[PDB]
Amino acid sequence: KNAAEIRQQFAMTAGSPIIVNDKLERYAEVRTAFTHPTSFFKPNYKGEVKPWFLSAYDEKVRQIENGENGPKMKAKNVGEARAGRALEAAGWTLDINYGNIYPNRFFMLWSGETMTNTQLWAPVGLDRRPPDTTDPVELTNYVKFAARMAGADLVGVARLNRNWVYSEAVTIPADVPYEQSLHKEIEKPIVFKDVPLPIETDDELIIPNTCENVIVAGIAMNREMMQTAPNSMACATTAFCYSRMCMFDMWLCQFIRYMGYYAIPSCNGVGQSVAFAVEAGLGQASRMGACITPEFGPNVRLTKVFTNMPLVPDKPIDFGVTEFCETCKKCARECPSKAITEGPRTFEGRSIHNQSGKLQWQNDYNKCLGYWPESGGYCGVCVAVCPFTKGNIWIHDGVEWLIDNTRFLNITEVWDGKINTYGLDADHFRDTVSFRKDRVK
């Protein structure tokens, strides 16, 4: 199996693959089901209406008390139930309020000047010296090498399509301390202006018009843990990867800054990761709505960094995902909340949570979020059942690579079973080896 061959075989010609029409407008981040008032509140198992994550907390507590790893899923004993939630909670250690979405706060600073690392290194002046390399070809090789050092299992580059940048971000005022953050969230416009550096004013988050490129990283989750969806160990691989995302953004932004350019981190903030990932060639959009990659299927998290560093955009990829999703529908049939549509793609949003004006399968994400308090986790059944999440999809017929159509026709054992560093799998880790030829052409 040769992942590089596969990507070469299915590479497209240049151009954003996402089909759009005239009703497309940039999307206010507050509209996501996590944040919007119509979906933010959910009942707990006692019928009390709370912020959804607090209702989910109540269900986690109830499951531990009852020795369960998930809804109606008995654990080996209470200690096993306890251990799954402890692993999940610890995974979030380097993530603020589930996703690091507030731009230019906490870990997501838009300038490195106040960071302890920048201060320590200031006598070398790497962040003030003009770039010594401006060649996009060399820069792309350098920045992708750095990206792999920084924990990315996949990395791609695209020109920044502003359609996918949130019109307004969810954030907090700069004078609000952490313990009040969840009570003091606000909206703030993201605007593009003729300014030298990313800068935040009292009224606006300002991205320079020179911010040409976006670097997208894929952060692979653990197959065995995700297959326990919707139970606790799927929550744990999700959580650990959010902290890997945060480390990646900070590492990479600092490299870019020390190369003489600016860099904006984001994790789950700033813009829509799936669209950037598609335009950067990591994978294709899917019925469930995730980016499906050849290496990991949808079982991979995304983050991204925006920069004026000259780079060579990668080519999009088309390995037949749209055509398999047309006939598969497994995620839609298994979804415990019936959130995923079984119908065709449209340009018309299903509800406020969807951005209209782009051709996609339109899913009801309030229904999805509604299952999270009920199950006490982050579900993931769609990711777990997707055939592309299986590690064994690719076959070679003597001429070229193809997808095996036959693929589309417990937690104690996970704790006692195979694991490796960062939950990566040595049986497949060769798929993400990288030489210069697969970083830049």
254-273: contacts with its own copies (CB under 8 A): 254-255, 258-260
* Interface size with its own copies, residues (CB under 8 A): 88
432 binds, among ligand SF4, its own copies, ligand DUB, none (CB under 5 to 8 A by kind): its own copies
251-310: contacts with ligand SF4 (CB under 6 A): 286-288
331 binds, among ligand SF4, its own copies, ligand DUB, none (CB under 5 to 8 A by kind): ligand SF4
- Minimum CB separation of residue 244 from ligand SF4 in Å reads 20
Q: Is 243 in the site for ligand DUB (CB under 6 A)?
A: no
411 torsion bin: left (phi>0), alpha (psi -120 to 50), beta (else): alpha
- Minimum CB separation of residue 98 from ligand SF4 in Å reads 15
Q: Strand, helix or coil at 392?
A: coil
Measured from each CB, the residue nearest to ligand DUB is 98
Q: Is 234 in the site for ligand SF4 (CB under 6 A)?
A: no
Q: Is 432 in the site for ligand DUB (CB under 6 A)?
A: no
Q: Is 434 in the site for its own copies (CB under 8 A)?
A: yes
**Is residue 388 within 8 Å of residue 365, measured between CB atoms?**
no
Question: Rounded CA gap, 345 and 259, in Å?
Answer: 42
Residue from 33, 235, 236, 312 touching its own copies (CB under 8 A): that is 236
99 binds, among its own copies, ligand SF4, ligand DUB, none (CB under 5 to 8 A by kind): ligand DUB
Q: Is 33 in the site for ligand SF4 (CB under 6 A)?
A: no
Which segment (22-30, 81-89, 165-173, 301-309) binds its own copies by CB under 8 A? Answer: 81-89
Three-class secondary structure assignment of 171-188 = ECCCCCCHHHHHHCCEEE
- Minimum CB separation of residue 240 from ligand DUB in Å reads 12
Taking every pair of Cα atoms in the chain, the longest distance, rounded to a whole number of angstroms, is: 63
The residue ranges of DSSP E strands in 150-289, in sequence order, are 154-159, 168-171, 186-193, 199-200, 205-208, 213-220, 263-264, 284-285
Residue from 331, 393, 403, 440 touching ligand SF4 (CB under 6 A): that is 331
Q: Which residues have C-beta within 8 Å of that of residue 155, sequence separation ≥ 6?
A: 144, 147, 148, 215, 216, 217, 218
Residue from 84, 91, 99, 218 touching ligand DUB (CB under 6 A): that is 99
Question: Rounded CA gap, 139 and 313, in Å?
Answer: 11
Q: Is 34 in the site for ligand DUB (CB under 6 A)?
A: yes
CA atoms within 13 A on the CB side of 38: 11
Task: Sort strands 284-285 and 291-292 into parallel, antiparallel or unpaired.
Answer: antiparallel
Q: Is 268 in the site for ligand DUB (CB under 6 A)?
A: yes
- Minimum CB separation of residue 1 from ligand DUB in Å reads 29
Cβ atoms within 10 Å of 15's Cβ, excluding its own: 9
Q: Which residues have C-beta within 8 Å of that of residue 384, sequence separation ≥ 6?
A: 226, 227, 228, 229, 234, 299
362-401: contacts with ligand DUB (CB under 6 A): 378
Alpha-carbon distances, residue 46 vs 58, 196, 368, 376 (angstroms): 9, 54, 20, 13
370-399: contacts with ligand SF4 (CB under 6 A): 371, 379-382, 385-388
268 binds, among its own copies, ligand DUB, ligand SF4, none (CB under 5 to 8 A by kind): ligand DUB
Question: Rounded CA gap, 208 and 191, in Å?
Answer: 8
Q: Strand, helix or coil at 50?
A: strand
Residues at the contact surface with ligand SF4, assessed by CB under 6 A? 286-288, 324-325, 328-331, 335-337, 339-340, 368, 371, 379-382, 385-388
Residues at the contact surface with ligand DUB, assessed by CB under 6 A? 34, 98-99, 238, 268, 378
